[PDB]
Structure formats: structure tokens, C-alpha cells
Amino acid sequence: MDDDIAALVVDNGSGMCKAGFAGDDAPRAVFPSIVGRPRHQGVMVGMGQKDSYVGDEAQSKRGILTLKYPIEHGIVTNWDDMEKIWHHTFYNELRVAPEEHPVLLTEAPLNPKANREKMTQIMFETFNTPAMYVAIQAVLSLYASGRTTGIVMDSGDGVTHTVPIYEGYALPHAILRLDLAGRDLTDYLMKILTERGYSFTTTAEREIVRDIKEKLCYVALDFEQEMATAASSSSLEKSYELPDGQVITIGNERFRCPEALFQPSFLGMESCGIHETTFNSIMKCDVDIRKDLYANTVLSGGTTMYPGIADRMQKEITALAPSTMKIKIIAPPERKYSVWIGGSILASLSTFQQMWISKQEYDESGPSIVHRKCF
Amino acid sequence: IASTMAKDVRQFWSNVEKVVQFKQQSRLEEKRKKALDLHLDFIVGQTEK
């Protein structure tokens, strides 16, 4: 391999796909991970009828396209749409040939072996990539945060995970999964807004509510005190202008929505909050490393972008953890891209050049080589 | 495999320290210039009296 060929990093997110070149400070492309198909034949006469659309092209045509999500809770459920998304990322977004650059892919923790083998087969047979590698999202997030040991609370758009890492070791016995992410939060926001008198039923109204969530919602340090303040004062209300010019008022729903992350009971889910989840994950590890896990608690994912979430996590983990442990929450400003940042970092290291799965290794061992090279 | 990768990425933090060395050098310069130049000017102005 020529030392001048930069490797490609592709963050496979449930809600947003991020792609770029190794060494760059930020991903060159960030688009939704969706695939749209025309609802009726003949609706696109003259607009270059395509059998399918991907990314923003399908997002802008949601009114006339049936959108599907090939990634559900961080697991690939439709491989044809995933191949379409990869072809898009390679040819339209990055505008490069995948057979000329190594491709580093990200996967959620505890990814089924069949999915890894299928990704390897797709990359080596469909795109003819010279080499590739698969890394865990939380591991890349930690490697981007500034540490090799610690616990990462990665909360994306489809699923949230607490991956305890010691010297880069995502401990499978201590990894906990929670089916609560930005999607369920957007659904709950729609629900509570319908309770307030603002009914959102269509998929475009769902995107409007998602934008409202990303713009106005925040994590309160004290839920009861914040509710009391909202009930006794309107200083916590904020106005939002709808696409049709109508201005609506968002009240306590700003912090009631993200509160589900700490109290899933609001969603009817019998699961522990993200703080309790992280505490239990740290407790499943050896006592010798719990100190470092507490001192290196990192936040990642788009769902972790709520203002004040870091302070709430600090408070909760300090109240739950022993008094002798020093709790430190790490929330980088660009934590939404920590996965891709760590991927690019790992791909830009010379010592990592020996970790790529070459086409020869794949042809000799098959897709199973991922289980021998990717951990 | 994962210990090898961890030790390989441990070099990135030595590189971050090499970067922080830039800030250390900046501070060293900003302080040494100030102190030495001020002391030189002061002692020269005191001897010329």
C-alpha cells in the first residue's frame, strides 16, 4: 500500500451516517441513514426517476417517498439499503472509489457475528475494498476523548450503550444496552406536545418536533425544582416558529422530554436510567479499575448533546458511587462526532497499518477473519 | 490484539503531550522575555543614575 493513500472512516449511525478521510479533524459528510422509494409510479416524470434515494435527497422528498431505516437500535436489519447507503457515501458524498482506499467501519457493542461477516463480505466483494477494519463505537469515542481507560456512555439516535473500557478493552461482561435514544425521545416529545395542545401526526411534523427537541430541550439538574419553577413561572418557556409561520410555545416539555433518559418510567419502560446504567456497568467490573472508570467517564453520541446533561450525570454518579471515588464526567464539545474522530485517529496511526484486514486474508479465511482481526 | 492497539494509541497521548509542550514553550517565552528584559532595563536605568 502507498503511504500517501488515506483510509476512509464511515460511522454507521442509526440516525446519521458520518464519513470522511483518516487524519481530517471532522467528517466531510454527515447525512441521515435512510433510503426512500417512490410511493407511486409516474410521480417523478421528468425529474430523473430513480429506483431509490438516500440521505438528504430522500429526506427532502419525504412527501412522495417511503423511507426505511436499515439500522434499528444500532443493528443492521436491511442489507440492501445498507449497501445503497454505502454506495452513496462512497460515490456521491466522498466522490471516491472504495477499491482505492481502506474503509474503517464502526459497529455498536455486542454486534451479531453474522452482521460482521456480512459487512466484511459486502466490503470485499461488492466494493472490492483493498482492506478494512471494524471498531466499536464506544472504543473510538474513548480514543477520541483523550484516554485509553474509562467508561463511555454512548447515546445515539437508535440505542444507548454503556461500554466500560480498560486499556482499550470493551468488557463484554460489563456492557449494558438500553433501547432508549433520540428516536424514542422525539416520540415522547410529540406525545407531550399533543398533551399541551400541539398535535403532530405526520412524518414531516415528526422532523419538526425532532428539530424542536435538538434546539430547545435540555437536561435539568433537579427535575422537581425545575417542574416547580415551570409551574410557578413562565421564564422557562421558549417560542418556536413552524414552517408555516405559526409560532408555538414550548414549556416544561423542554426538560420533561430528556428526563426519560434518567427516568425511563415516563416511557413505560422497566429499565434503569443512563446514570444507574453506567453505575451498574462500572459495578460489574473489577474493583481495581472502578476508580479509573469513574475518573474517566466519557459522554458520546448525538443524544448526549443536551445542555446540562454532564452536570446531571456528575450529580447522579456522585450520589450513587462511593464517597471515596472521584467522579469526573467528560463531555467534549464535539462529542457528537467522537466516534468518527476516533476512527480517523486510529486509521491515521502507522502502528495500526498492521491491523487492517487485507483482501488476501479475506480470500484465504473468508468473512470470519473479522472475528480474528477485529475485537 | 487489543493490548497492542491500546499501546499503539498510547502514542497519540504522548503526541498530545508534545503539543502541550508548545503551550509550555509559549508560556516560558512570554515569561522569560518579560522578566529578563524588565530586569535588564531596570538595572541599566539604576546604574546609569
Curated annotation (Swiss-Prot), chain A:
There is a cross-link at E270 ((Microbial infection) Isoglutamyl lysine isopeptide (Glu-Lys) (interchain with K-50)). Changing G146A: In CSMH; somatic variant. ISGylated. The modification Methionine (R)-sulfoxide is found at M44, M47. Changing W79E: Does not affect methylation by SETD3. It holds the Pfam family Actin. The modification N-acetylmethionine is found at M1. The modification Tele-methylhistidine is found at H73. The keyword Cytoplasm applies. It comes from the Eukaryota. Actin is a highly conserved protein that polymerizes to produce filaments that form cross-linked networks in the cytoplasm of cells. Actin exists in both monomeric (G-actin) and polymeric (F-actin) forms, both forms playing key functions, such as cell motility and contraction. In addition to their role in the cytoplasmic cytoskeleton, G- and F-actin also localize in the nucleus, and regulate gene transcription and motility and repair of damaged DNA. This is Actin, cytoplasmic 1.
Curated annotation (Swiss-Prot), chain B:
It comes from the Eukaryota. It is found in: Nucleus. It is linked to Floating-Harbor syndrome: A rare genetic disorder characterized by proportionate short stature, delayed bone age, delayed speech development, and typical facial features. The face is triangular with deep-set eyes, long eyelashes, bulbous nose, wide columella, short philtrum, and thin lips. Developmental delay, hypotonia, musculoskeletal defects, and behavioral abnormalities: An autosomal dominant disorder characterized by developmental delay, speech delay, mild to severe intellectual disability, hypotonia, musculoskeletal features, and behavioral abnormalities including autistic features. Skeletal anomalies include joint hypermobility, chronic musculoskeletal pain, scoliosis, and pectus defects. Affected individuals also have non-specific and variable dysmorphic facial features. Catalytic component of the SRCAP complex which mediates the ATP-dependent exchange of histone H2AZ/H2B dimers for nucleosomal H2A/H2B, leading to transcriptional regulation of selected genes by chromatin remodeling. Acts as a coactivator for CREB-mediated transcription, steroid receptor-mediated transcription, and Notch-mediated transcription. Interacts with CREBBP and EP300. May be part of a complex containing SRCAP, CREBBP, CARM1 and GRIP1. Component of the chromatin-remodeling SRCAP complex composed of at least SRCAP, DMAP1, RUVBL1, RUVBL2, ACTL6A, YEATS4, VPS72, ACTR6 and ZNHIT1. Component of a NuA4-related complex which contains EP400, TRRAP/PAF400, SRCAP, BRD8/SMAP, EPC1, DMAP1/DNMAP1, RUVBL1/TIP49, RUVBL2, actin, ACTL6A/BAF53A, VPS72 and YEATS4/GAS41. Belongs to the SNF2/RAD54 helicase family. SWR1 subfamily. This is Helicase SRCAP. It comes from Homo sapiens.
